[PDB]
Amino acid sequence: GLLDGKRILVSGIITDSSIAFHIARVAQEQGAQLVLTGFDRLRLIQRITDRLPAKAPLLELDVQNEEHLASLAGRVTEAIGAGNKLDGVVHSIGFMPQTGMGINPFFDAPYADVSKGIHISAYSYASMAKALLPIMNPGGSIVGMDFDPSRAMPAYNWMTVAKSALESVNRFVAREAGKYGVRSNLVAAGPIRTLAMSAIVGGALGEEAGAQIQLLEEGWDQRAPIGWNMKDATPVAKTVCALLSDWLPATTGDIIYADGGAHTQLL
Amino acid sequence: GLLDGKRILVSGIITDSSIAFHIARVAQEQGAQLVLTGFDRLRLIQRITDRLPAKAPLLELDVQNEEHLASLAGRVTEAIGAGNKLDGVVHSIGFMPQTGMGINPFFDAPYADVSKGIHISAYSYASMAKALLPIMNPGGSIVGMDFDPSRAMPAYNWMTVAKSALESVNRFVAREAGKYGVRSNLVAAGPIRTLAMSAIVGGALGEEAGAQIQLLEEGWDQRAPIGWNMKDATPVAKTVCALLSDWLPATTGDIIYADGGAHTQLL
Amino acid sequence: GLLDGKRILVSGIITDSSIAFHIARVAQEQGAQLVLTGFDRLRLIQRITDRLPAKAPLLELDVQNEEHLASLAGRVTEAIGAGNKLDGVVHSIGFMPQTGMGINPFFDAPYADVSKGIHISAYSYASMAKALLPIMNPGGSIVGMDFDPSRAMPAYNWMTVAKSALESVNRFVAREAGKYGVRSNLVAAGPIRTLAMSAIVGGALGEEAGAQIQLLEEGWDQRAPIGWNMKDATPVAKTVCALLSDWLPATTGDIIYADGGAHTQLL
Amino acid sequence: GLLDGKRILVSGIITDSSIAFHIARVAQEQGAQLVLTGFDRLRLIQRITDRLPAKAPLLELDVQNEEHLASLAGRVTEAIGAGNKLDGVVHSIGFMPQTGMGINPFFDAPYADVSKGIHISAYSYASMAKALLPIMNPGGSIVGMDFDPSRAMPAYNWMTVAKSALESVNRFVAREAGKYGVRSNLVAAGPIRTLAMSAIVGGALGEEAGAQIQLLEEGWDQRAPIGWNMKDATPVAKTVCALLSDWLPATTGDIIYADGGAHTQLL
Ligand SMILES: NC(=O)c1ccc[n+]([C@@H]2O[C@H](COP(=O)([O-])OP(=O)(O)OC[C@H]3O[C@@H](n4cnc5c(N)ncnc54)[C@H](O)[C@@H]3O)[C@@H](O)[C@H]2O)c1
Ligand SMILES: NC(=O)c1ccc[n+]([C@@H]2O[C@H](COP(=O)([O-])OP(=O)(O)OC[C@H]3O[C@@H](n4cnc5c(N)ncnc54)[C@H](O)[C@@H]3O)[C@@H](O)[C@H]2O)c1
Ligand SMILES: NC(=O)c1ccc[n+]([C@@H]2O[C@H](COP(=O)([O-])OP(=O)(O)OC[C@H]3O[C@@H](n4cnc5c(N)ncnc54)[C@H](O)[C@@H]3O)[C@@H](O)[C@H]2O)c1
Ligand SMILES: NC(=O)c1ccc[n+]([C@@H]2O[C@H](COP(=O)([O-])OP(=O)(O)OC[C@H]3O[C@@H](n4cnc5c(N)ncnc54)[C@H](O)[C@@H]3O)[C@@H](O)[C@H]2O)c1
Ligand SMILES: O=C(O)/C=C/c1cccc(C(F)(F)F)c1
Ligand SMILES: O=C(O)/C=C/c1cccc(C(F)(F)F)c1
Ligand SMILES: O=C(O)/C=C/c1cccc(C(F)(F)F)c1
Ligand SMILES: O=C(O)/C=C/c1cccc(C(F)(F)F)c1
């Protein structure tokens, strides 16, 4: 297995369509021993993760809760055993209030809403690294999930801004992680039909935002030289596992694009 | 004059070494009629701006104050006269609490501090555009001040993250401003010895942060094919005036580098 | 005038739809004294440039002719008078054999054809700088024409590769030009309906290449927050004049996008 | 093994310090069956590759020889057996005449020399893809070697321009390769002390070019958050193997940086 013997923490599972669910599945298929973290609905998350190939301890983590973060390392060590450390950390956490996405005009999002989204989607990447680097082995790897924000797009709005901040945060986390012999990188995925994404395309945030997202998705498969299947998160999961392995040992502070090549093509 | 007849709002003057002071001076030398905005110390700012070549009305603007923003357009129209609109807006506003810069470790900045810095340094670019676009003429231009955040650097820390967010915000403001026939762009300046910057180099945020900033400044002049004079903000001011003029009419959502060419060179 | 008193060489006029024709027109409107260079059809070019607002000497320059380049500085000094130097140089030269563009497959262009296109479109930017920098004044400016090659696109094919090379060449020319106090920059224009471009859209290089170019053009105006008029080269000409002026004095080795903002937007 | 059962062609071995030698070693350690290609000194190359963990057929390939390219697919199929196809292709080929590198001024390289370097270092990536894609399996992968050319640097000179062209070529090769279900990507390596590189640092291309290269190398390890060992090509080889594997299945037209993270950091 690509990850045989590695101990890896995976955040961000909420449904069976979560990108993190497929990261966890593939990592377990490749021999990794997982610790999972979940937010708010731990009963639901436990029922979801019961469908993974192997059992994994589930710990509560609200990345806005300073007490959850202060205790996280101790709770992880309790789960994997004293004297054992983590080899991998997966950040698959994102949120932006609906005022900062959708048909609500970009100018109408209040800063309280934007700040909450930047807290959860960008600052928390630094928060998790701060908490977990002291229990990470040399040669370890931290990976977060990104959506290419280098150009503006309709509807994504403030979530795009949060991803631009996350990319900048990743470059500073790499500086800190390097002192531990640990890499830090993001995977910029193409669009994936999660429950939330399908709801938006169905009009949950207004009709025009739904129409814009659908047009965005269609251009992606058209641009990608190898195509793009928004219903299949497995290529994204494999790319995360690649970064968690020892096979990209000189890459850090960086972004790997698991997007079909779409960002390399204009039309 | 390059800006003859144009009515331009300039934020961000606090001392005579403020980049915005030199923007205002050059704009007035080029025939623009200015409205100035200042934060908190309006008595001091008035005394400072008395040294500009021409008198200009000064309005109070704390970009974190929703009431200041809601009234800003009316106060500007009162200053320039009913029936007159703005042709230009200059955002020269930035702040990050010292916990997010300097020798305080990157991981030790609390999110309340980071959020305040992102509010003032990035979100407020959208806030000012929201307030002023309804009183801007077609062909108008909004310009904000940037510091290239595409790579991490020592000490800048969370302020770098805020600039990454600002660049993303600028691309969305351009979408909105375009409906008004208005351009939105940033000027990414090289380092300029403002009062705050000189204090940091003198050790105000710790000795190692001061040493890192000084090394950063020295490499800049070395890399710049035409050199870089951190004691001279006039080239930055002229570049802002270029974007405020009619001579870059097909550039928007973009970044112009007034940095000596340093960002185009590795060594 | 923006360029009053400046002596500026402009290459690349071949028809009245040439981007360089509009650069020359606007520069003369702004008070510049021009020297023109033309390739192969000097009788035709003279008849074309007779329609410019002011007379200008026309010199023959085939950038593949080492003898033309070796004599160019002397012929320019003879035209503007001994003791006078150039303040500006405009490179508006590009060519790629049809085997390297159009419906002919990317893999089918022979290297002899590609090499000729890279010679004319990229290496010659260095060739002209080598020839003219010794007769350029401090504070001078060299500008070349670019088409954003950061992503692949249909039909442009090897010409895209040549533009990627040109952008790299520009960064090295800036290093050399800086020793003379001269800036070097490119303007990346949106698509402009020159005679050659209209012929391609009409099917001169095959129907599918024509269809691809037309779709490329349409997406450009759609993406540009301020729109894009491919029939109007005047915004591109003004941006070149901006770089030729003294109003971007700290920008070199760089690229200014005169494209409506289209490259800052995904959809 | 990461590459068990895969049939992979590796070009570019000339000494035991060649990056391609270490690519081949690691690929064989990971179970790949190799076909090697060599240029000009096949007796020497055979003696060198005798030290690889497994025997591999060696075929002559001068990428400037149209007859070598026209026959290459048939010679590969003869080596791996009829009915078998390649799963991987490694382009590790580069050359620029000394007039285009070193202390010889950038402006003094004749175009004949530059054109030869661009032929070997950039066009040949398309040439090899044209030759080998018809005998490549779906899910296959083409990888070429890159050195980040996004900023100019001393001494690299025209070789930097060639790498900028190669990056553009890679994006078009991905378009073609996608029709075969094949990915195309580059690995941008940090500096590696090959025989040629050590000779340049020793002054083979002039003293100042040697001094500039040494300073470039030292800044690299300083910038890299995980450090950079120019004497160890193994991290670069592993990254190439990662791209040759099935673990980056949604990445194409792209660049993976195996450089210690140095390109993500300013100082
Ligand atoms: N779906 C896409 O198209 C796409 C593309 C690229 C990147 N991404 C990114 O991938 C990440 C995962 O998102 P997803 O698509 O799988 O959707 P998701 O809804 O399945 O996952 C979001 C996760 O964030 C977690 N979360 C929210 N608030 C939290 C908090 N306070 N503390 C801890 N966790 C919290 C959710 O509980 C949930 O598990 C996100 O960063 C997302 O931006 C998604
Ligand atoms: N000095 C440099 O080296 C440099 C380089 C590039 C960009 N910049 C940017 O240029 C901008 C101007 O900074 P400066 O260098 O001239 O320093 P400065 O201190 O002179 O200007 C900062 C300005 O921000 C204003 N400000 C702070 N909080 C505010 C608030 N709540 N509301 C309104 N205004 C507020 C200050 O009052 C002050 O006028 C900043 O965005 C800065 O990041 C500076
Ligand atoms: N038209 C567009 O859409 C567009 C967009 C961006 C950039 N550009 C660039 O702008 C430049 C000008 O092109 P244009 O669009 O105006 O088309 P054009 O055909 O009008 O200009 C091309 C010029 O190149 C010159 N030229 C060709 N071979 C030459 C040689 N051996 N020596 C000297 N000159 C030679 C032609 O004679 C001609 O004057 C080109 O670099 C082009 O790539 C064009
Ligand atoms: N050494 C570094 O620091 C470094 C860094 C990044 C990338 N690279 C790239 O890695 C690649 C491999 O270079 P290297 O460092 O290992 O040096 P090298 O000298 O070992 O390899 C160069 C190879 O190019 C081959 N070659 C030259 N002309 C050829 C031709 N006409 N046909 C076929 N092959 C030809 C040589 O025979 C030789 O095998 C190059 O593309 C190089 O630019 C090197
Ligand atoms: O980060 C996230 O959770 C969302 C990612 C995403 C998914 C589908 C479409 C888009 C769009 F905005 F590009 F349309 C974005
Ligand atoms: O945005 C600001 O106000 C500060 C900009 C700045 C000034 C001098 C040095 C640096 C450094 F961080 F690069 F060193 C940054
Ligand atoms: O450089 C040139 O002369 C051509 C530029 C150009 C003009 C119109 C369309 C396109 C396209 F390839 F994007 F379609 C390119
Ligand atoms: O591509 C190549 O073969 C050379 C790559 C290389 C190796 C060492 C140093 C440098 C420098 F130019 F950055 F110094 C480049």
Closest C-alpha among C21, C26, C19 to residue C2:
C26
D154–B267 CB contact, under 8 Å: yes
Kindly list the strands in the beta sheet with A33-38, ordered across the sheet, starting from the edge strand earlier in the chain: A58-60, A33-38, A7-11, A86-91, A136-146, A183-189, A254-258
What whole-number distance in Å separates Cα of residue B164 and Cα of residue B188? 11
- Contact status, residue B255 vs residue B185, Cβ threshold 8 Å: yes
Instruction: State the maximum Cα–Cα separation within chain D, in Å, rounded to a whole number.
Output: 54
Q: Which residues of A116-142 are buried (b: 16+ CB within 10 A; e: fewer)?
A: bbbbbbbbbbbbbbbbbbebbbeebbb
DSSP labels, chain B: -TTTT-EEEEE---STT-HHHHHHHHHHHTT-EEEEEE-S-HHHHHHHHTTSSS---EEE--TT-HHHHHHHHHHHHHHH-TT--EEEEEE------GGGSTTS-GGG--HHHHHHHHIIIIIHHHHHHHHHGGGEEEEEEEEEEE---SSB-TTTTHHHHHHHHHHHHHHHHHHHHHTTT-EEEEEEE-----HHHHHHHTTTT-HHHHHHHHHHHHHHHHH-TT---TT--HHHHHHHHHHHSSSSTT--SEEEEESTTGGGB--
Measured distance CA(B14)–CA(B49) in Å, rounded: 9
Please compute, for residue A85, the number of CA atoms within 13 A of its CA located in the half-sphere on the CB side.
Answer: 14
Distance from CA of C38 to the nearest CA of D (A): 21
- Following DSSP, what letter does each residue of D126-190 receive, concatenated? HHHHHHHGGGEEEEEEEEEEE---SSB-TTTTHHHHHHHHHHHHHHHHHHHHHTTT-EEEEEEE-
Query: Residue D107, class by beta-carbon neighbours within 10 Å (0-12 exposed, 13-18 middle, 19+ buried)?
Result: middle
Q: Which amino acid is at A137?
A: N
- CB contact under 8 Å between C190 and B265, yes or no, is no
Phi and psi angles of residue C223, each rounded to the nearest 5 degrees, phi first: -75, -35
Structural resolution in Å: 1.8
Binning chain A into helix, strand and coil, the percentages to the nearest 5 are 45, 15, 35
| Terminal-residue alpha carbon distance, chain A | 38
Buried b (16+ CB within 10 A) or exposed e, A189-212: bbbbebebbeebbeeebbeebbeb
Pick the closest to residue D261 from D221, D217, D215, D230 (CA basis). D221
Would you call C211 exposed, middle or buried from its count of C-beta atoms within 10 A (0-12, 13-18, 19+)?
Answer: middle
Q: Is A145 helix (H, G, I), strand (E, B) or coil?
A: strand
Beta bridge partners of D86: D136
- Residue C201 to residue C231: CA distance in whole angstroms: 13
Residue D174 contacts residue D218 (beta carbons within 8 Å): no
Query: Three-state DSSP class for C244?
Result: helix
Q: How far apart are CA A252 and CA C195, in angstroms?
A: 48
Cα–Cα distances in angstroms (integers) from residue B175 to residues B141, B185, D81, in the given order = 13, 11, 58
CA distances from D177 to A220, D15, D82, D187 (A): 18, 30, 22, 17
Q: Is the Cβ atom of C186 under 6 angstroms away from ligand 7?
A: no
Which structure tokens are listed for B159?
Answer: 């302020």
Question: Domains along chain D?
Answer: 1-267 (3.40.50.720)
Buried b (16+ CB within 10 A) or exposed e, C98-133: ebbbbbbebeebebebbbbbbbbbbbbbbbbbbbbb
Q: Using a CB-CB distance cutoff of 8 angstroms, which residues of chain C are in contact with residue A263?
A: 151
Distance CA(C196)–CA(C191), nearest Å, equals 12
Q: Is D119 exposed, middle or buried (0-12, 13-18, 19+ CB in 10 A)?
A: buried
- The response to whether D62 counts as a known ligand-binding position is yes
E strand segments, chain D: 7-11, 33-38, 58-60, 86-91, 136-146, 183-189, 254-258
Q: What angle do CA D12, D14, D15 make, to 5 degrees?
A: 130
> Experimental method used, please?
X-ray
Q: Where are the alpha helices (DSSP H) in chain A?
A: 19-29, 42-49, 66-80, 111-118, 124-132, 158-178, 195-201, 207-223, 234-244
CB proximity D165 to C under 8 Å: yes
Tell which phi-psi region holds residue C40, choosing left (phi > 0), alpha (psi between -120 and 50) or beta. left
Pairwise CA distance, residues A162 & A68, whole Å: 22
Cβ atoms of C238 and B230 within 8 Å: the answer is no
- Tokens at D73, concatenated: 């697919």
Report the SS3 class of residue D101. coil
Gap between the Cα atoms of C164 and C170, Å rounded: 10
Compute the distance between CA of residue B88 and CA of residue B30 in angstroms, rounded to an integer: 13
**Alpha-carbon separation of residue C106 from A124, C191, D70, D132 (angstroms):** 45, 21, 17, 15
Whether A178 has a binding-site annotation, put simply, is no
Place of tokens 């999972």: A36
C243 neighbors C253 (Cβ within 8 angstroms): no
The residue type of C225 is P
Query: In 3D, which of A165, A145, A149, A166 has the Cα closest to residue A157?
Result: A149
Confirm whether residue A19 is marked as ligand binding. Answer: yes
Interchain pair B122, A169: CB under 8 A: no
User: What does the DSSP 8-state code read for residue D120?
Assistant: I
C-alpha dist (Å) from residue B82 to A177, B74, B75, B77: 57, 9, 11, 6
Tokens of B35: 């409205």
| Amino acid letter for position A163 | K
Distance between CA atoms of A90 and A9, rounded to whole angstroms? Answer: 6
Residues of A in contact with C154 (CB under 8 A): 267
Closest CB to D238 among A181, A249, A256: A249
Whose C-alpha lies nearest to ligand 3, atom 41? Answer: C94
* Region for C26 from its dihedrals, namely left if φ exceeds 0, alpha if ψ lies in -120 to 50, beta otherwise: alpha
> Distance of CA A1 to CAs A25, A28, B6, C110, D105, Å?
13, 9, 67, 45, 52
CA distance B75 to B153: 40
Cβ-count burial of A89 within 10 angstroms (0-12 exposed, 13-18 middle, 19+ buried)?
A: buried
Query: Can you tell me whether residue D225 is helix, strand or coil?
Result: coil
| Three-class secondary structure of residue D123 per DSSP | helix
For ligand 3, say whether the CB of C92 is within 6 Å of any of its atoms: yes
For residue D94, give the 3-state DSSP assignment.
Answer: coil
- Who among A111, A127, A160 is closest to B119 (CB)? A111
- Short-list D74, D80, D212, D81, CA closest to D131: D74
Q: Are D8 and D36 contacting, i.e. CB atoms less than 8 angstroms apart?
A: no
Which residue's CA is the closest to the ligand 4 atom numbered 39? D12
**Token pair belonging to A102:** 């959708």
**Residue B190 and residue B217 in contact, taking contact as beta carbons nearer than 8 Å:** no
Q: What are phi and psi of C71, to 5 degrees?
A: -95, -5
Q: For C214-219, which contacts have Cβ atoms below 8 Å and span 24 or more sequence positions?
A: C215/A267, C216/A266, C216/A267, C216/C153, C216/C154, C216/C155, C216/C191, C217/C191, C219/A267, C219/C262
CA-closest candidate to residue C147, choices C255, C38, C27, C15: C255
Report phi then psi at B4, rounded to 5. Answer: -60, 130
Q: Nearest-CA neighbor of D150 among A225, C172, B237, C7?
A: C172
Q: How many CB atoms lie within 10 A of CB D144?
A: 30
D213: tokens are 């290269």
- Return the best residue to mutate from A125, A146, A158, A197 for the ligand 5 pocket (most ligand atoms within 8 A of CB): A197
Give the gap in angstroms from C-alpha D56 to the nearest C-alpha of chain C: 29
Rounded to an integer, what distance in angstroms lies between the CA atom of residue D222 and that of residue D230? 12
Rounded CA separation D246/A237 (Å): 12
